[PDB]
Amino acid sequence: DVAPYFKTEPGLPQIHLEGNRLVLTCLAEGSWPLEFKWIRNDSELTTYSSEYKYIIPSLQKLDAGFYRCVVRNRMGALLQRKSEIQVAYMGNFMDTDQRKTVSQGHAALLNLLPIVSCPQPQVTWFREGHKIIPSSRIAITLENQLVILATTASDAGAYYVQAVNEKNGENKTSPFIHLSVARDTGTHEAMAPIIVVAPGNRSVVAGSSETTLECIANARPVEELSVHWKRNGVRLTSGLHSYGRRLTITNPTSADTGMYVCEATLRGSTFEPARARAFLSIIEPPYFTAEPESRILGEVEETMDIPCRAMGVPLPTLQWYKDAVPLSKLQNPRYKVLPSGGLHIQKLSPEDSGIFQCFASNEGGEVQTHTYLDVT
């Protein structure tokens, strides 16, 4: 009379190479007979058997997904926490050149040519065999876009990238972006600061090691451009990188949350500074504030309340299962999920015996609790 339980749990996401072997194991204990089956995303890959492992001899791209095992015995069935399986690959660039024109003095934003890859590739920008290096007038964004500030006639040319997949070592060369610069054939005058890449908003899971905001401005003469960051009106003097364009917040906590301001100034000018706001927030993963007892006894025809309550930021959503089947699919009229969390069962039936499982989740993660209900 021991309900199934897991001896071990799956851990962090894993990236695997195409062509490699994947082994998943479902290690559980409990009364005889323990049987197992496997799920990927929301499809069952196998039917119940005594086999406790799932093996893919040679991984392909669309083996990537979320894998769960289910363990059952005569008492009920229990759904395991998900394993996230990612498969490394690198596609090809389209073999067609692009064209782009920019008016002199304005920033040229050159996007990374489209390529599908897991993980995202490391990128190097080139023109005519020479690497394009970040500088006071050249920025490469966190999403590997090339930004040329205060463009001059000399910036015209054929730009391309070499992309490398860090996990499988593959490298690809893109076609060209042919950048034309339309010259200003008048006297060059100062150009006011303008934000060309704004930092936007950022949400991080509590405990994160670092997060980085990015703000890129144009002005002319670009040598007189300054980009600074402010927090509560005061200029920040830590976490600064890339000519003021990046602000790294290390081990962000609740003290760090709220608004940050990027401010771009043209020195020697009386232009108003350009400003952009960024908001940092923290996701707090779910935790239970109420779990049911591990075992509950009910009498037939009576009612049953199975508690489940969880906290987190944002407030976690709860999902119930009975014997590894979601209540949303069972559509049992007698099972009432209470908005605040618990499950209320009207008129207990012998069929209600089994394992009830409550999952709590938000963007920061998922936790689970369960009970074995014995109806007599």
PDB file of C-alpha atoms in Angstrom, residues 212 229 239-248:
ATOM      1  CA  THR A 212      22.419  43.759 -19.044  1.00  0.00           C
ATOM      2  CA  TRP A 229      22.778  55.765 -17.019  1.00  0.00           C
ATOM      3  CA  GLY A 239      28.446  47.938 -14.298  1.00  0.00           C
ATOM      4  CA  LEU A 240      29.319  50.221 -17.234  1.00  0.00           C
ATOM      5  CA  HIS A 241      30.653  48.776 -20.508  1.00  0.00           C
ATOM      6  CA  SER A 242      30.834  49.434 -24.255  1.00  0.00           C
ATOM      7  CA  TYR A 243      31.251  53.247 -24.397  1.00  0.00           C
ATOM      8  CA  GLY A 244      28.420  53.768 -21.932  1.00  0.00           C
ATOM      9  CA  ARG A 245      26.006  51.739 -24.040  1.00  0.00           C
ATOM     10  CA  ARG A 246      25.666  48.810 -21.650  1.00  0.00           C
ATOM     11  CA  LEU A 247      24.689  48.687 -17.984  1.00  0.00           C
ATOM     12  CA  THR A 248      25.108  45.356 -16.240  1.00  0.00           C
TER      13      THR A 248
END
